[model samples]
Target: KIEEGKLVIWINGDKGYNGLAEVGKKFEKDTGIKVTVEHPDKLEEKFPQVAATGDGPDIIFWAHDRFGGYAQSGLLAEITPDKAFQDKLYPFTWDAVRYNGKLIAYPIAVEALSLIYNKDLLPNPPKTWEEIPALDKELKAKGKSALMFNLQEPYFTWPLIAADGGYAFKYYDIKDVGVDNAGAKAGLTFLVDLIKNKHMNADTDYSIAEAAFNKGETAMTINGPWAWSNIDTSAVNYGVTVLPTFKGQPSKPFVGVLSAGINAASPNKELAKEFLENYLLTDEGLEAVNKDKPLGAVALKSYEEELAKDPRIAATMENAQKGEIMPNIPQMSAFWYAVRTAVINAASGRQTVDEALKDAQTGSELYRQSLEIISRYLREQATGAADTAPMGASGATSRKALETLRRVGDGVQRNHETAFQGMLRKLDIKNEDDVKSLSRVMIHVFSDGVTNWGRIVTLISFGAFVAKHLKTINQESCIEPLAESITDVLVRTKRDWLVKQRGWDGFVEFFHV
Candidate 1:
């Protein structure tokens, strides 16, 4: 056996370990190549630029969500799997890795949140949010907590919203935000009551919740399979089941896939690619990961069938089926902080449920508006219309629409008018097109920069200017390239602002990222 190049793999987070270890050793022995596995933390912050230097690993093991950003940025190698290998994967798993007609990685695991409860405390898990209150009251009477989770985090809150017919998207459209509705508000209020009633503490986060559940202080906790190892089996007899219902609908958690992406600049491309496609995707490889512990619900067909026969992995897979796959788009970058803050503020009594939700909606809208501003600025600069901006009263009119999105009774909305008026004076009016572009920028300032900043109505303007402008631009020039240039600025501006306003180190949201 001989090898000319070394194969190094980097894992981003805690998801892949025992399996990666086994596989790496086997890969080295089989191919006579030196294989190394690294637990590199904060790959998002480092990997892109690092990989561009061609100093990165052959494989990057990470969650599927990050795959979109990395693959689009060209940090990952393109993979073309033939029918045989492709057919072995679950449809959803295949879809998760296919970024722009290329398979970016091999999906190794599938996961979703489920109700992990102590069987000894309650013979039967409550089927609805309505039933939980009475059970909570009963448990509290005995000096125990009925249920707890990372209440402030949106990941847990979203399932409750989904259970009641509120989801992140309407009809599976990425452009639409499905959170602003009666059902979502109802689900939010249900959470607020859970904390307000003293059944669950406002400060109970992952550590506190996990400890309480393990110590038998809590009868139930909402968690994922990755969290199962943290449970202290000696103290409590725990069981896992699908999330409870809200109203008449069952709660559905988001399904996340753990996969490994090939670094585009790896020294050994074909060798690494085949190893991932063939060796890692095989039944033997799948079992190596699952034999000790469920790395995650199995993704491959043959191995999944065997794992499902075990009620342990089967329960997790059953819950995974109930979920919509988490959209891997970069725009999801804007979703977490907004919703998590809303839930936390409402749970902690800082704001009413309506106010918190409104703030979250408004925050997203502000980020969207910022993009429109950046896009308009770029478009105008390119078209020579940047010399003179619009002086029309539309900017003021736009300010009124933007004000509706501001935090209620904060007096911040009133203050934005002065800044809006001042910013208006600097840009000179030119034409109707100029007025529209400048108005978007004005709306951006009015919504995000001026006011502190709702409804699913947040993305309304998203479709509006985008559709109207792109359509008008199409008759005159190439559409998508310029549109993409604008969107690039918008998405990045919004993403950066979200990261700065509230750092991304949230309890559950960080783990989700």
Candidate 2:
């Protein structure tokens, strides 16, 4: 297991990579195990697929939200940080990486959306949303908006939505979707009124809002530290504060933690753990990472003094403390899309706030039901019940069908270069490097609430083709992982149709040849 003598870590941004690279250099000198820090494109989408094969980075660094899915999928190793180490970090940070009462990752920094304002424009930021109209009236005279942000983005608007008590999911309970509830309805209405009353622009998006704020076109914007660099570049005299209250209630943004976790399948677990605990979690380690680009708010209490010295970081942490930790559950995927749609529909005058929120709630509930169906199918398959389930033509068991399909995959591999060329191009699959892109493409294509037997067969056939390619490349171990991922996409996207067809049994019958 120690034969490799190297550790690979995947992160998302250059600033984070630079910080970890510094830590890697020191760790290399001290332990002789080389550390490679990479900021790979599509790291979020690719990590799950690659890690399933046990062939990717030993460590992953990203926001905490995705770690719940990773942990639930058994992709992350359970970590037991020493109680002393745990005690040194903020308590809320643990919520980011803990799933099913198991610690899955070490928290590094915490972030949340806050009110960022041009100090020169406002002199003082408003204390509540009620003040926005007066500020808007004053700023309107100056040809500027009082507030602006990525209006339809759920992440940026969650504070407003949840200000009165709206939530996508109750903590740890995917079944309890609160998007269309009274509180949430009130919140969405507030946003719609803002647009209608000319307090904010309807067309503003992340880039537009960020640019406007940086250029001093808007008095304030709701954003996080990630946008600070752009604002700095523009030399905007800016200040950060907790989001103003809405109807006398504090706006609650989703708190996100940037964290690190070890791959469950990694061979060098102990070495990786040592590096994380002994080197990367230390004062010097935290400082090195924060040196180039400040993490805004370090999770470790040991860095509190440093955090206090910076007003921006301090203000961010204050908002984060009052915020709810973003739900890391996989169901959050549905919440994001559903709520975003609701936001867009309501904001664009496509639907009333009530109608949009109701649609979002219904969409999320359907998603939850779909996941339940898939989970039950997976359970039955594991218990041998699915194999005996009734089927149409051939009456072949699920196991038998999988074996045949795997063989068909082998046949497909022989012609992979030309097989499904048109479909591959549509999916933008140019080479083996693009195999990880397949799941996303499949998800997008099938999640449109449309399906047929032909499309279903095509999707599974594509999965078999990709599995064959992985086998041809000497990664025979990856075939099953590829299947499970494909199964996930199918069940999530085509749940009702799949149930009507008797699931995989129907799949075998449909393409028995």
Candidate 3:
């Protein structure tokens, strides 16, 4: 049972070199394994290089987001650890390993981001960021400092985004990322406005602010519970508090997954699973971790007592109740750049609050549409009676068809013009011959885009859906303009249908065009 190999890791490595050294030491000492730790200063550059060359370390200890990309590309080794490892890790960790139904990485820590403040300084924090100013004014009057800020890094702002019910991804068939909806934009606006209004002290970094908060220099900060053990009680006295509310909406947090996956490329893959035997299936491994970092329990039994005593963590779990589990969909990597761009834009005021988000959404859709080949195949396979050809699909009306329709259509135009030109002719238009001419052109125009009978029926069904719901079509619009209108009808109707069918708010996150 000797698990000897070089292990690779990144995260707090630059700053917490000591932590990694300690882990490597403990692991080797316990397992009689020889371990080597490789830290990458820039993982973004290193991961691709390592994967491309196939010369990376035997094991990679990284964050969930980065691991997602690695997993989808078939670069990862399988990890089906036994009972032991699973028991110790948080539920979110197991979820992290499963990227697109495949386990990809080993999770190290279970964490979440929440709004943290000293309960004594402000017994009840503002439900929304807007109210933070009023609370600040109250604190200012009372001569109590109101904030502990570290805005240099973007991690701190996530709570507000989560509170406003926004995210970087929306799950359709899978996660569609780079999406900014009204809620997410509103949340960002709330954060930027908070900084602008001095509701938060954005002057210092986390360590400095954390130290100051412990010394009572400031009272509130948006953070996680890890600060509990980190804060030395010898200096200050404060109680753990729940996150602030947002717009009467509780500010939620993203539950970080701490999972352990067997390296797909590892020669020691089976051994990794052996490590989890007593850990995952039973509560023994879970019970041994004596840290208050996270309570040991995914199952209801272990935490039953903790749940009774500590309602706050219970509430924290509630914040993560509807969280997006870790997934390994290929589309997610495509979203990271866009999500970061939108988030930064919203944070920096480079784009309009609304426009930036809308642009992000439009970009997401365009990117999604980039997979049109897949869409076409899927569309072809579908037998939905209401399924119509998208405007760009094959068998659509050619220029010749339009011209033919136009020629017939022009005769109707001429008849109308002639009727208008003379009231005498207008009265004579009641004749079957004259009426038939106009009706013929009307039919031609209606059938102009039709190819197969199914398409014709689809167009009619969808046109009915639009005319029933949206006042999009009129007697005048045609061709390119009409084509766009038809698309709108399809997107809206289909999307709403999906929403009801899915019964989840997360599905339509990037649904808008």
Model 3: per-residue lDDT, tens digit, 1-513?
Answer: 213453544433322334345555555667765445555666544664566445555555444666665765456776655565456555656676676675566555445554556666766655556666787778878766676655555455556666666765555443244346666777778776766776654356678777767767666765554465555453554545456667667655556544434445566554444444423223433333324334312332454344436544554455556444434454444444444555566656676667656555544453233233222222222222223555342122222222232233334435454433453233333333443343334344444653332332244332232222222222222222233334333332343232232211221222212
- Model 3 TM-score on a 0 to 1 scale: 0.60
RMSD in Å for model 3: 16.3
lDDT of 1 by residue, 265-336 (tens): 776888787778777788998777665445667679888877667565777777777778887765554566
Of the candidates numbered 1 and 2, which has the greater TM-score value? 1
Greater-lDDT candidate between 1 and 2 = 2
Candidate with top lDDT is 2
> With candidate 1 superimposed using the best TM-score fit, by how many Å does residue 488's alpha carbon deviate from the native?
3.6
Sort the candidates on TM-score, descending order.
1, 2, 3
Off by over 4 Å in 3: 1-4, 11-23, 37-45, 63-65, 82-93, 106-110, 141-145, 149-155, 171-178, 201-205, 270-312, 322-328, 333-336, 362-367, 373-513
Query: By summed lDDT, which 10 consecutive residues of candidate 3 come out lowest?
Result: 503-512
Q: Estimate, for each residue in 1-513, the C-alpha lDDT of model 2 and write its tens digit.
A: 213668998987634568789899998998898998898886877888888767688999887988887886789999987888889888988877888989999888887888999999999999998889889999999988899899857888889889999987776666677888888888889889999998877788987898889899999999877667777889989999989998889999988898898998888888889988888878899888776666768787887676678888878978987788887887666567678888998999988998788667766655444333333333332333433444322234435555555445435545554756566456554444465566566677666645775565455666655544454456545445445566677656665455455555565677677
Every model's TM-score: 0.72, 0.70, 0.60
- How far in Å is the alpha carbon of 241 misplaced in model 1? 1.1
Report lDDT (Cα) of residue 461, candidate 2: 62
Measured over all alpha carbons after superposition, the RMSD of each candidate to the real structure, in angstroms, is 10.1, 10.4, 16.3
Give the range where candidate 2 is weakest over 10 consecutive residues by summed lDDT: 373-382
Score each candidate by Cα lDDT.
Answer: 0.65, 0.75, 0.48
State the weakest 10-residue window (summed lDDT) of model 1. Answer: 450-459
